[PDB]
């Protein structure tokens, strides 16, 4: 689906949809259907289920996976793009000026990026990630601090609330005052 | 593994170990090994791994699954006794005087018990559940309110901290003042 964060001197903003989707049926079919939703081709949920009995899939939903959490002045988000055997997670930590992104298999944690400074990020299905990328330039100028960007995230969250079905229509957003050096959280998660 | 709660007029106490265990290898073997740990036959973790290369299993661990949580004056605990395809959860809600236990498959939530009044409960592997049952009578008299029982849980938590390896040596305990009518939490989880 999608979740997004922004990092700067003032603060950090992380917004995430709460939708998780369960796929049951011919696994070759599942990757045949999965294509179409990821590619972004439908939005209405009635136009979602339509196709499903065309291909053979039963698809339980609940728009309340808590895709971001606020552990201690750092905001954590995470996409469970599971696909089959077990677990395929993919998580971020952010604060004011500090930021990193990690890829999880099951228990195992693998990093992919870090550092300090200023950034805008998202994770998703290919399409959802693209639509956030549209909107962030849309409404973003360096002539903002946090405060505008916080609204930006909502429009973008609406924008793909609007134009898609892989993303829970309810969504949750959290903020930090703190330049917490997010680096530690990852080591604690690894000992865990 | 194990987690335990006590319910009375004053309050509720829920204590849970944080250990989750990952099983990799010949699935027929896994149920062959799983027997022995559940039955309770080992405690030291070096005497844990020993047997594993005897049978062919790689077993990643982390003693920090958050087996209980405090959502709003009600304490929730949950054993993920997964065994294979997907998810086999099993959860409780408790407060001061009110209590219920639900069985989860994946998304789906099934109840098994409810009501109001006074109780002592646990979930686990067969052995761990038994050892808590020992200890609760050990140190329990109706001539207690909460306050003793809160310590009881620790000894029992130590007692199977002690005498077993399926249970994380670190553990977490939470308490409520409130006779919150735990009933609505199950319905909220179902809409979710």
Numbering used by the authors:
A (entry chain B), B (entry chain A): 1 to 192
Quote what the paper states about this structure:
The discovery of peptide ligase activity in the Connectase family of enzymes (CETs) from archaea has expanded protease repurposing strategies. However, original CETs exhibit significant residual protease activity, leading to nonprocessive (reversible) ligation and limiting their application. In this study, we present crystal structures of a highly active protein ligase from Methanococcus maripaludis (MmCET) in both its apo- and substrate-bound forms. By determining the crystal structure of MmCET, both with and without a preferred peptide substrate at its catalytic transition state, we uncovered the essential elements responsible for the high-precision substrate recognition of N-terminal motifs.
To this end, we first attempted to capture MmCET in both its apo form and its peptide substrate-bound form. In this conformation, cysteines in MmCET form a stable intermolecular disulfide bond (C65–C193), locking the enzyme in a dimeric state and constraining the crystal lattice. Interestingly, removing these cysteines via site-directed mutagenesis did not affect the crystallization, and ligand-free enzymes were still observed in the same crystal form. Moreover, volume analysis of the substrate pocket of the free MmCET structure revealed significant potential for designing more favorable peptide substrates.
